[PDB]
Coordinates of C-alpha atoms (C1' of nucleotides) in Angstrom, one line a residue:
Chain A
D1 CA 0.0 0.2 -0.1
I2 CA 0.9 3.6 -0.6
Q3 CA 1.3 5.6 2.8
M4 CA 1.0 8.7 3.0
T5 CA 2.4 11.1 5.8
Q6 CA 1.2 14.4 6.9
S7 CA 3.8 15.3 9.2
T8 CA 2.8 18.1 10.9
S9 CA -0.7 17.0 12.3
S10 CA -2.1 20.0 13.9
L11 CA -0.8 24.1 13.8
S12 CA -1.9 27.6 14.6
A13 CA -2.1 30.6 11.8
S14 CA -3.6 34.4 12.3
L15 CA -5.9 35.7 9.8
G16 CA -4.0 36.4 6.9
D17 CA -1.2 34.2 7.5
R18 CA 0.2 31.9 4.6
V19 CA -0.2 28.3 5.6
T20 CA 1.2 25.4 4.4
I21 CA 0.3 21.7 5.1
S22 CA 2.5 19.0 3.6
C23 CA 2.0 15.6 2.5
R24 CA 5.0 12.7 1.6
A25 CA 3.6 9.7 -0.5
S26 CA 5.4 6.4 0.1
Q27 CA 5.9 5.9 -3.8
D28 CA 5.5 8.0 -6.8
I29 CA 2.4 8.6 -7.4
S30 CA 2.3 10.9 -10.6
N31 CA 0.5 13.9 -9.2
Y32 CA -2.9 12.1 -8.4
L33 CA -3.0 13.3 -6.1
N34 CA -6.2 15.6 -3.9
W35 CA -6.6 17.5 -0.3
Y36 CA -9.6 17.8 1.6
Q37 CA -11.3 20.4 4.0
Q38 CA -12.9 18.4 7.4
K39 CA -15.2 20.5 8.7
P40 CA -15.8 20.7 13.1
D41 CA -19.1 19.4 12.5
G42 CA -17.8 16.6 10.9
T43 CA -19.0 18.2 7.0
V44 CA -15.8 16.8 4.0
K45 CA -15.6 18.7 1.0
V46 CA -12.9 18.3 -1.8
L47 CA -10.4 21.2 -2.1
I48 CA -8.0 20.8 -5.0
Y49 CA -7.4 17.3 -6.8
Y50 CA -4.5 16.4 -9.7
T51 CA -1.6 18.1 -7.1
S52 CA -3.3 21.4 -8.3
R53 CA -6.3 22.0 -10.1
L54 CA -8.6 23.9 -8.3
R55 CA -12.4 22.3 -7.3
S56 CA -15.3 24.5 -8.6
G57 CA -16.7 26.8 -6.1
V58 CA -13.6 26.3 -3.9
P59 CA -12.6 30.0 -3.3
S60 CA -8.9 30.5 -5.2
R61 CA -7.0 31.2 -1.5
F62 CA -6.1 27.0 -1.6
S63 CA -4.0 25.9 -3.8
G64 CA -1.8 22.8 -4.3
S65 CA 2.0 21.9 -6.0
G66 CA 4.3 19.1 -5.8
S67 CA 5.0 16.0 -8.0
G68 CA 6.6 12.6 -7.8
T69 CA 5.9 11.7 -3.7
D70 CA 6.3 15.7 -2.6
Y71 CA 3.4 17.7 -2.0
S72 CA 1.8 21.0 -1.0
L73 CA -1.3 22.7 0.3
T74 CA -1.6 26.5 0.2
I75 CA -4.1 28.7 2.0
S76 CA -2.7 32.1 1.3
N77 CA -4.7 35.0 3.0
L78 CA -6.0 32.8 5.7
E79 CA -10.0 33.4 6.6
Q80 CA -11.9 32.7 9.8
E81 CA -14.0 29.8 8.1
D82 CA -11.0 27.7 7.6
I83 CA -10.6 26.1 11.1
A84 CA -10.9 22.8 10.2
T85 CA -8.9 19.3 9.4
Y86 CA -7.1 18.8 5.8
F87 CA -6.4 15.6 4.9
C88 CA -4.3 14.8 1.3
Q89 CA -4.8 11.5 -0.8
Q90 CA -3.9 9.8 -3.1
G91 CA -5.6 8.2 -5.9
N92 CA -3.0 6.6 -8.6
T93 CA -3.8 2.9 -6.7
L94 CA -5.8 1.1 -4.5
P95 CA -6.4 1.2 -1.5
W96 CA -6.4 5.0 -2.4
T97 CA -5.1 5.9 1.6
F98 CA -5.4 8.9 3.6
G99 CA -2.9 10.8 5.1
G100 CA -3.2 11.2 8.6
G101 CA -4.9 15.0 8.5
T102 CA -3.2 18.7 9.7
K103 CA -6.3 20.4 12.4
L104 CA -5.7 23.7 11.9
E105 CA -6.7 26.4 15.2
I106 CA -7.2 30.2 13.9
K107 CA -6.2 32.8 16.7
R108 CA -7.3 35.7 18.0
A109 CA -7.5 38.0 20.7
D110 CA -7.6 37.0 24.4
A111 CA -11.2 36.9 25.9
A112 CA -11.9 36.1 29.9
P113 CA -14.6 32.8 30.0
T114 CA -18.0 34.2 31.0
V115 CA -18.6 31.1 34.3
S116 CA -22.0 29.8 34.8
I117 CA -22.3 27.5 37.5
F118 CA -25.1 25.0 38.4
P119 CA -26.8 22.7 41.6
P120 CA -27.5 18.8 40.8
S121 CA -31.8 18.8 39.9
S122 CA -34.3 18.0 41.9
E123 CA -35.0 14.6 39.3
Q124 CA -31.6 13.6 40.1
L125 CA -31.5 14.3 43.7
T126 CA -34.7 11.9 43.8
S127 CA -32.8 9.1 42.3
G128 CA -29.8 8.9 44.4
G129 CA -27.1 10.9 42.4
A130 CA -25.2 15.2 42.7
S131 CA -24.0 16.2 39.4
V132 CA -22.6 19.9 39.8
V133 CA -21.7 21.4 36.2
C134 CA -20.0 24.3 35.5
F135 CA -19.9 26.2 31.8
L136 CA -16.9 28.3 30.7
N137 CA -17.9 30.0 27.7
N138 CA -16.4 31.4 24.8
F139 CA -12.2 32.0 26.5
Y140 CA -9.1 31.9 24.6
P141 CA -6.7 30.3 24.3
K142 CA -7.5 26.9 25.2
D143 CA -5.7 26.4 28.3
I144 CA -8.3 26.6 31.2
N145 CA -7.7 25.4 34.6
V146 CA -11.1 24.7 36.1
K147 CA -11.1 23.2 40.6
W148 CA -14.5 23.0 42.4
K149 CA -14.3 23.6 46.0
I150 CA -17.0 22.2 48.3
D151 CA -17.3 24.3 51.6
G152 CA -13.9 25.9 50.4
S153 CA -11.8 22.5 49.9
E154 CA -10.8 21.3 46.3
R155 CA -12.8 18.3 45.3
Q156 CA -11.1 16.3 42.0
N157 CA -12.6 12.6 42.5
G158 CA -16.3 12.0 39.9
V159 CA -14.6 15.6 37.4
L160 CA -15.6 15.1 34.1
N161 CA -14.7 18.1 31.8
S162 CA -15.3 18.5 27.9
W163 CA -14.0 21.4 25.6
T164 CA -15.8 22.4 22.7
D165 CA -14.1 22.6 19.6
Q166 CA -13.2 26.7 17.9
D167 CA -15.7 28.3 17.0
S168 CA -16.1 28.8 13.3
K169 CA -17.2 32.4 13.7
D170 CA -15.6 33.9 16.2
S171 CA -12.5 31.3 17.2
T172 CA -13.1 30.6 21.2
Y173 CA -13.6 27.5 22.8
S174 CA -16.2 26.2 25.8
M175 CA -15.6 24.2 28.2
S176 CA -18.0 22.3 30.8
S177 CA -17.2 21.2 34.1
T178 CA -18.7 17.9 36.1
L179 CA -18.5 17.2 38.8
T180 CA -20.9 14.0 40.4
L181 CA -21.5 12.7 43.7
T182 CA -24.2 10.6 45.6
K183 CA -26.9 12.3 47.0
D184 CA -25.6 11.3 50.6
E185 CA -22.2 12.9 49.8
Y186 CA -23.5 16.0 47.8
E187 CA -26.6 17.1 50.8
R188 CA -23.6 16.8 53.5
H189 CA -21.5 20.6 52.3
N190 CA -23.8 23.5 51.6
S191 CA -21.5 26.3 49.7
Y192 CA -20.3 24.8 45.8
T193 CA -18.2 26.5 43.8
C194 CA -16.1 25.8 40.2
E195 CA -12.8 28.4 39.5
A196 CA -12.2 29.1 36.6
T197 CA -7.9 30.3 36.1
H198 CA -7.0 31.5 32.7
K199 CA -3.8 33.6 31.3
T200 CA -6.5 37.0 30.5
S201 CA -6.7 37.6 34.4
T202 CA -4.5 37.2 37.9
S203 CA -7.2 36.0 39.8
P204 CA -9.5 33.7 38.8
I205 CA -13.5 33.8 37.7
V206 CA -15.4 32.5 40.3
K207 CA -19.2 31.0 40.7
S208 CA -20.7 29.7 43.7
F209 CA -24.4 28.8 45.2
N210 CA -25.2 27.5 48.6
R211 CA -26.9 24.3 48.9
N212 CA -29.5 25.4 51.6
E213 CA -30.4 28.3 49.3
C214 CA -31.9 25.7 46.5
Chain C
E1 CA -27.1 20.6 -5.2
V2 CA -26.4 17.3 -4.3
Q3 CA -27.4 15.3 -1.7
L4 CA -26.3 12.0 0.0
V5 CA -28.0 11.1 3.1
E6 CA -27.2 8.6 5.1
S7 CA -28.7 5.2 7.1
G8 CA -28.9 2.8 8.9
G9 CA -25.6 2.8 11.4
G10 CA -26.4 2.1 14.8
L11 CA -24.9 -0.3 18.1
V12 CA -24.1 -4.1 16.5
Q13 CA -22.3 -6.8 18.1
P14 CA -18.5 -8.2 17.5
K15 CA -19.0 -10.9 15.2
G16 CA -22.4 -9.2 14.3
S17 CA -24.2 -7.7 10.8
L18 CA -25.7 -4.7 9.6
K19 CA -26.7 -2.6 6.7
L20 CA -26.6 1.0 5.7
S21 CA -28.2 2.6 3.2
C22 CA -27.5 6.2 0.9
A23 CA -30.2 8.0 -0.6
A24 CA -28.6 10.0 -3.3
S25 CA -30.4 13.1 -5.5
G26 CA -29.4 16.1 -7.7
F27 CA -26.7 14.3 -10.2
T28 CA -27.2 11.5 -12.8
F29 CA -26.5 8.9 -10.1
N30 CA -26.5 5.8 -12.6
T31 CA -23.2 7.3 -14.7
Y32 CA -21.3 7.5 -11.0
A33 CA -19.1 5.3 -9.1
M34 CA -20.0 5.0 -5.6
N35 CA -17.6 4.8 -2.8
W36 CA -17.8 4.5 1.2
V37 CA -15.4 5.8 3.5
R38 CA -14.7 5.7 6.9
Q39 CA -13.9 7.0 10.2
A40 CA -12.7 5.9 12.9
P41 CA -13.2 9.1 16.6
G42 CA -10.4 11.2 16.9
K43 CA -9.4 9.6 13.5
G44 CA -8.4 9.5 10.1
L45 CA -10.6 9.0 7.3
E46 CA -10.0 5.7 4.9
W47 CA -11.9 4.9 2.3
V48 CA -14.2 1.3 2.4
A49 CA -15.1 0.3 -1.1
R50 CA -16.2 1.5 -4.3
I51 CA -18.9 -0.3 -6.9
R52 CA -18.4 1.3 -10.5
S53 CA -21.7 2.4 -12.8
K54 CA -23.6 -0.1 -14.3
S55 CA -21.3 1.0 -17.8
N56 CA -18.4 -0.8 -16.3
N57 CA -20.6 -4.2 -15.1
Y58 CA -20.8 -2.6 -11.3
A59 CA -17.2 -3.7 -10.6
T60 CA -16.2 -4.1 -6.8
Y61 CA -13.2 -3.1 -5.0
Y62 CA -12.3 -3.1 -0.5
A63 CA -9.9 -1.8 1.2
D64 CA -7.6 -4.9 2.7
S65 CA -9.2 -4.0 6.2
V66 CA -12.9 -5.0 5.1
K67 CA -12.5 -7.2 2.0
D68 CA -14.6 -10.9 1.9
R69 CA -16.8 -9.4 4.8
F70 CA -18.3 -6.2 3.6
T71 CA -20.2 -5.6 0.1
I72 CA -20.7 -3.2 -1.9
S73 CA -24.0 -2.9 -4.3
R74 CA -26.7 -0.2 -5.7
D75 CA -29.7 0.4 -7.1
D76 CA -29.6 2.5 -9.2
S77 CA -34.0 2.4 -10.2
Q78 CA -34.1 4.5 -6.2
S79 CA -31.0 6.0 -6.3
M80 CA -29.4 3.7 -3.8
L81 CA -25.7 3.0 -2.0
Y82 CA -25.9 0.2 -0.2
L83 CA -22.8 -1.5 2.7
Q84 CA -23.5 -4.8 3.6
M85 CA -21.0 -5.2 6.5
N86 CA -21.1 -8.8 8.1
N87 CA -18.5 -10.6 11.3
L88 CA -18.2 -6.8 12.3
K89 CA -15.1 -6.0 14.4
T90 CA -14.3 -3.3 17.7
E91 CA -12.3 -1.5 15.2
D92 CA -15.2 -1.6 12.4
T93 CA -16.8 1.6 15.0
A94 CA -16.5 4.4 12.3
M95 CA -18.5 7.4 10.6
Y96 CA -19.3 6.1 7.5
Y97 CA -19.6 8.6 4.7
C98 CA -21.6 7.8 1.4
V99 CA -19.2 9.4 -1.2
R100 CA -20.5 9.9 -5.5
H101 CA -16.6 9.4 -7.4
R102 CA -15.1 11.7 -9.9
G103 CA -17.3 12.6 -12.9
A104 CA -15.1 11.4 -16.7
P105 CA -12.0 11.0 -16.1
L106 CA -11.7 12.8 -19.5
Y107 CA -11.5 16.1 -18.1
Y108 CA -11.3 15.1 -14.5
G109 CA -8.1 13.0 -14.8
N110 CA -8.2 9.8 -14.1
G111 CA -6.8 9.6 -10.6
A112 CA -9.7 9.0 -8.3
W113 CA -10.9 11.4 -5.8
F114 CA -13.7 12.5 -4.4
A115 CA -16.5 14.3 -5.1
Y116 CA -18.9 14.6 -3.1
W117 CA -19.7 13.6 0.1
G118 CA -22.4 12.4 3.0
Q119 CA -22.5 13.9 6.4
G120 CA -22.4 10.1 8.3
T121 CA -23.9 6.9 9.7
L122 CA -22.4 6.2 12.6
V123 CA -21.2 2.2 12.7
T124 CA -20.3 1.0 16.8
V125 CA -19.7 -2.3 17.1
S126 CA -19.5 -3.4 20.8
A127 CA -20.6 -5.5 23.5
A128 CA -22.4 -3.1 25.6
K129 CA -25.7 -2.7 25.7
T130 CA -28.0 0.0 24.6
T131 CA -28.8 2.1 27.4
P132 CA -30.7 5.3 27.2
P133 CA -29.6 8.9 29.1
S134 CA -30.8 10.1 31.8
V135 CA -31.3 14.4 31.2
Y136 CA -31.4 17.0 34.0
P137 CA -32.4 20.3 33.0
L138 CA -29.8 22.8 34.6
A139 CA -31.4 25.9 35.7
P140 CA -29.4 28.8 37.3
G141 CA -30.5 29.0 41.2
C142 CA -32.5 31.6 43.5
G143 CA -29.2 34.2 44.1
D144 CA -26.9 36.8 42.0
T145 CA -28.2 37.7 37.8
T146 CA -26.1 39.4 35.7
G147 CA -29.0 41.8 33.8
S148 CA -27.4 41.6 30.4
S149 CA -28.2 37.7 29.5
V150 CA -28.8 33.7 31.3
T151 CA -27.3 30.5 30.7
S152 CA -28.7 27.1 30.9
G153 CA -28.4 24.2 29.8
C154 CA -29.3 20.5 30.0
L155 CA -26.9 17.6 31.6
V156 CA -27.0 14.3 29.5
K157 CA -25.9 11.3 31.5
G158 CA -25.0 8.1 31.2
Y159 CA -25.9 7.1 27.7
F160 CA -24.6 4.1 25.5
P161 CA -24.1 4.3 22.1
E162 CA -23.0 7.4 21.0
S163 CA -24.9 9.9 19.8
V164 CA -27.7 12.6 21.3
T165 CA -28.6 15.5 19.3
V166 CA -30.1 17.7 21.7
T167 CA -32.1 20.6 20.0
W168 CA -33.3 24.6 22.2
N169 CA -37.3 25.5 21.5
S170 CA -37.3 22.9 18.4
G171 CA -34.5 24.3 16.5
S172 CA -35.1 28.1 17.1
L173 CA -32.3 29.0 18.9
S174 CA -29.3 27.8 17.6
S175 CA -27.2 31.5 17.9
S176 CA -26.0 31.1 21.5
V177 CA -26.0 27.1 22.3
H178 CA -22.6 25.2 23.3
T179 CA -22.6 21.4 22.7
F180 CA -19.6 20.1 24.7
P181 CA -18.8 16.3 23.6
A182 CA -19.4 13.6 24.9
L183 CA -16.3 11.5 27.3
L184 CA -17.1 8.3 27.8
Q185 CA -17.0 7.4 31.6
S186 CA -17.3 3.5 33.4
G187 CA -19.0 2.5 30.0
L188 CA -21.4 4.9 29.5
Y189 CA -21.6 7.9 27.7
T190 CA -21.7 12.0 28.9
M191 CA -22.6 15.1 27.4
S192 CA -24.2 18.7 27.7
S193 CA -25.6 21.5 26.4
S194 CA -26.2 24.9 27.2
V195 CA -28.0 28.3 26.0
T196 CA -27.6 31.6 27.0
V197 CA -30.3 34.3 26.4
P198 CA -31.2 37.8 27.1
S199 CA -32.4 37.9 30.4
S200 CA -36.0 39.8 29.7
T201 CA -36.9 36.9 27.9
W202 CA -36.6 34.2 30.3
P203 CA -37.9 32.8 32.6
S204 CA -41.1 35.1 31.2
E205 CA -40.7 33.2 27.8
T206 CA -40.0 29.2 27.5
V207 CA -37.0 27.2 27.0
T208 CA -37.0 23.8 26.6
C209 CA -34.0 20.9 25.9
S210 CA -35.2 18.4 23.8
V211 CA -32.2 15.3 23.8
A212 CA -33.4 12.5 20.8
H213 CA -31.3 9.2 21.9
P214 CA -32.6 7.2 18.6
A215 CA -29.8 4.2 19.6
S216 CA -32.6 3.2 22.6
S217 CA -35.6 5.2 20.6
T218 CA -36.1 8.4 23.2
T219 CA -36.9 11.6 23.1
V220 CA -36.1 13.3 26.7
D221 CA -37.6 16.9 26.7
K222 CA -37.3 19.5 30.0
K223 CA -38.9 22.9 30.1
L224 CA -36.5 25.2 32.2
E225 CA -38.1 26.4 35.5
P226 CA -36.7 28.7 38.0
Chain Z
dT1 C1' -16.4 4.8 -18.5
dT2 C1' -12.7 6.9 -26.0
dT3 C1' -12.2 4.0 -29.8

DNA sequence: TTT
């Protein structure tokens, strides 16, 4: 089989930048090398075929070059809508094989998260469980830390954190943090807070509720 | 516009079977080769199989990984593509895309490429049983108020397999929704979804999350309350 | 999917 290698699996670039994504084939593929864009939502489209031919309806900022084993996709003047994973594919011989993909993040100005906290539902409490939820929305850069404080003490056990993909319109991220306890455990403390630490502030962004006021 | 609509994805046990379908429209189905392409979770694309047109006697070809287990076929009268998958394996777990081949090679080159893609159907090969989600509303408790906006949510807990879809007010609210990818905890998935609206329009006006888990035939709605 |  022909192995296709995209040695860069991820990169970050600013609006207006030149982005170059490369692809190496394990043997000569006679310019039968094509490029695809996969949006964060999973939508795939073809950009370039036969090394350099631009697919009808695809913006001219996408161009392809190469020969033999070595090929490149260039995005000139990067735009907001170009957040995606880019894949090369050889169509010279079966099985037709793809590169491993290059995920493109687009930079923006730093932005602090909007924090929201949520007590367990009565529905869940009835079932014998207690999940407290914190949302940190619309922040940049992606790196962020969330701590759970129960009556002032840090709680890490039973915590699950999920980041969104980068937002296609404004390049921000959001994250959800869920702390799950038994209802018995929940009931025996009052103060619940999540604290967000992010490069945008010297002190954390904090949200809190008290159980016996809910 | 070209449309390729996959169906038939779902949970199947190792060594079991599943048939995928794709309903094509917006082009002359019977003149094109058709493919399936797949993508295992968090991984890259892998070509699965091709079937040529009737003019090329419906010649078929398969990736080595699926040969003698999968059968690609088509029904030109109904503009349908099929993938019968037998003796399924864990590593067949993937999103499966129906894909129309490039057209006339005199114009488009001999080399194979994939001109139009469907949105995919998810296939999960696992020993674990279908488990519907518990859905809980996430409402702000009685406390401080940031005048401009309020953020509400829905927690979707302890389901299998993927995936679920959460919509807010029957798809009317789209801008301010965030969907948090599911995470696997102790054999079961959990995800959440948030929506943010002007604080005038709630609670005065109503906000509801609708959670679909097709694998367990469940739809659950939580009307959000102070 | 040229012959």
